Design a protein around this nucleic acid. Structure first.
Ligand SMILES: [Mn+2]
Length: 259
DNA sequence: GCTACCATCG
DNA sequence: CGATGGGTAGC
């Protein structure tokens, strides 16, 4: 049984403060994809690099206390790719790939364009140059999980107030259209949507108002899976027993064996 | 201090 | 629909 976790820690140090470290072991997971480390290698402790003896790898940004993704794994990954290859986005560190034989897990931090229009443009280009990547990986022949903060809502079911957010970044017709071109066109499987067609599955609630309390959140964290592995998925859930961050850890469980 | 990241109301 | 607001992490 292969348990994979995706979690935007929104600063890994705070998460470890709020008992995320302990949680990693408690969940008895085999792979953990974290987004937004908000730090650098020199900034992280040994436990934030190799939690509980679990191997680990990371991509950090040039900016201190900014962005950064990582992947922990009980098994020693055969190959590792830091950064997409596009320096423009690699200077922010949002892509980390780890091959574990037949399997390849990817931690992705899709840029959020809700801070400025220019950031929205950078996000758009990210999508444009990343689509071909999703396609190539779709045509490798290996089972590839993509855990990440896509920061894009697909349908009206993926967010509580889908009605008053069409003029807001994250639910813009363009972005949603891209996602569609990924699931149906590219042939990826929205693991959660495929396991639970009627469950909202919110994974993020804004600090504004009392949203988190009223379960007024979005679903911006995805695990896009290849058909072969997609079918092998047995369950999934959004862990909320403890709040480590404004995001909630997506825990998917597959009946897979990379060996 | 500066940077980055929409729910409730008028 | 449009006008009108917010608290986080980390340097
Ligand atoms: Mn964040």
């Amino acid at each position: 049984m292969l348990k994979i976790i995706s979690a935007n820690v929104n600063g890994i140090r705070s998460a470890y403060k709020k008992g995320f470290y302990e949680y990693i072991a408690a969940s008895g997971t085999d792979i953990v994809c974290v987004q937004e480390l908000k730090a650098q290698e020199a900034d992280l402790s040994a436990d934030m690099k190799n939690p509980h003896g679990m191997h680990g790898h990371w991509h950090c940004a040039e900016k201190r206390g900014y962005s950064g993704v990582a992947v922990y794994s009980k098994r020693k990954p055969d190959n590792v790719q830091i950064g997409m290859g596009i320096e423009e986005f690699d200077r922010e560190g949002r892509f980390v790939r780890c091959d574990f034989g037949r399997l390849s897990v990817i931690s992705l931090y899709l840029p959020s364009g809700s801070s400025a229009e220019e950031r929205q443009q950078v996000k758009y280009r990210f999508l444009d140059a990343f689509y071909p990547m999703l396609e190539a990986m779709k045509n490798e022949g290996r089972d590839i999980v993509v855990c990440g903060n896509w920061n894009i809502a697909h349908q009206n079911i993926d967010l509580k107030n889908w009605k008053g957010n069409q003029k807001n970044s994250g639910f813009l017709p363009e972005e949603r259209e891209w996602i569609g071109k990924v699931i149906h066109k590219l042939g990826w499987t929205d693991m959660w949507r495929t396991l639970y067609p009627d469950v909202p599955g919110y994974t993020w609630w804004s600090n504004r108002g009392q949203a988190y309390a009223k379960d007024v959140g979005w679903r911006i964290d995805y695990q896009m899976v290849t058909p072969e592995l997609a079918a092998k998925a047995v369950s999934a859930h959004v862990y909320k027993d403890e709040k480590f961050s404004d995001h909630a850890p997506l825990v998917v469980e597959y009946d897979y064996a990379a060996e």
